[model samples]
Target: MSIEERLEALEKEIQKMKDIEEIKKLKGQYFRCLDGKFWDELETTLSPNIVTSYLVFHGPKEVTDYFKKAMPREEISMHMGHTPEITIDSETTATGRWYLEDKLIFTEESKYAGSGVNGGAFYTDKYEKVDGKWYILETGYLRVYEEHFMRDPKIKITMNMHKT
Candidate 1:
């Protein structure tokens, strides 16, 4: 190949790498926003008309509203977003998978109280590049496992949300 052609190819490769980096950073920001309880940033990261679904969980409204309500400035929470496998379709479109681990303490609601109650799931997300920035257009999760603690020592909460 000619030198010019080789340089052009190199440039394209570099641009692709940059796009991947941007997507990775966005994913990082997502986790940070959630763990940090930066609800404002979370809202900004998503598209205005976003579609979110959760299986092995419950409705989006409940999740979103719960987060909004539970995410207090003084409360302590940990959300670990990991193992993102991103696929860039173009400069304007992409998809990603995120594994999430969240542990929370609800001081106001004893029923929701738990210590290091481990749970995680995989998030399938669609991304759209608008005005040179990527935003989450659609997001969904398929929970692998969910458990909680209650006053009844033997009561173990699982992915079965309908159970209570």
Candidate 2:
């Protein structure tokens, strides 16, 4: 290959690596947004026309509504996404797999499920670059393990105990 061609090839390779890193950072930001309850930050991470599917789990309609209606000001939740394996097809397209763990607290309604819960799952996601920024185009999850707890009968529920 000519020197110019070699240089171009090297630059392309470096760009691919950078794309992978960007995707990883995107996943980290996703976890941070969820755990820190920075609901506003989420809009930047997802495309307005994003398509999300859930297998043996809840769909995006319910999930998005729950986040919009309940999550911003109510129950605190944390999501940890780890070990992202990313494949970049071009400067504007990529895919990734991530392992996720989540914890949530429903402070107001112990009467329904009667307890807070913690769970973990795996996420498979497709990402796209739009106007030089990456956004999640599609995402799906599989539950690896989960656990639920019940409020102790002896512990009385009181308004004072609730988090403000």
Candidate 3:
């Protein structure tokens, strides 16, 4: 069946928008899961064969397990990703880059209590859609800079979201 060129172009444009919007939501959920220490949710956002450039892990379960151990419930983490550049390469594949600003805070229960690090990095991520849902196929980051500091004993951490 032959279709009008104008309508065909319109369809493509709408699909482009839909894909972009869904990808944005996926990335946001990823960050939210990380900050909230939702290990299962984080694992769900990745593909089964996901790989990270900065880490030795290759699967979603291993990745989340590594994170759960490295960043236990007592630590506080805040992550922000902005200025995203997302490109949809094919029907089920996309690539993106995000500038990341994150901070790690230590609580009394942490091994590095009263110490923390503030850092920035650029994340390169690949996404694959399966069954109408997007999953991170690969994600990695390189630190641009890091500043390590000790929390002043006089300053108190009055509240923390991840504290339990």
Each model's lDDT: 0.69, 0.70, 0.89
- Pairs that collide in candidate 3 are none
Q: Give one digit per residue, the lDDT tens place, for model 2 in 98-146.
A: 8887876655543343466788888889888888778777888899989
* Prediction-by-prediction clash tally: 0, 0, 0
Give per-residue lDDT, candidate 2, residue 160.
32
Q: Sort the candidates on TM-score, descending order.
A: 3, 2, 1
What's the TM-score of each model vs. the native? 0.71, 0.76, 0.90
TM-score of 1: 0.71
RMSD of 3: 2.2
Off by over 4 Å in 1: 53-66, 70-75, 108-116, 151-164
Instruction: Please write out the lDDT profile of model 1 over residues 13-79, one tens digit for every residue.
Output: 8987888888888778877777666666766677645554533324334445566765654345666
Displacement of the residue 11 alpha carbon in candidate 2, Å: 0.8
Per-residue error for 163 in candidate 1, Å, reads 31
Q: What C-alpha lDDT does candidate 3 achieve relative to the native structure? A: 0.89
Off by over 4 Å in 2: 52-66, 70-72, 108-114, 151-163
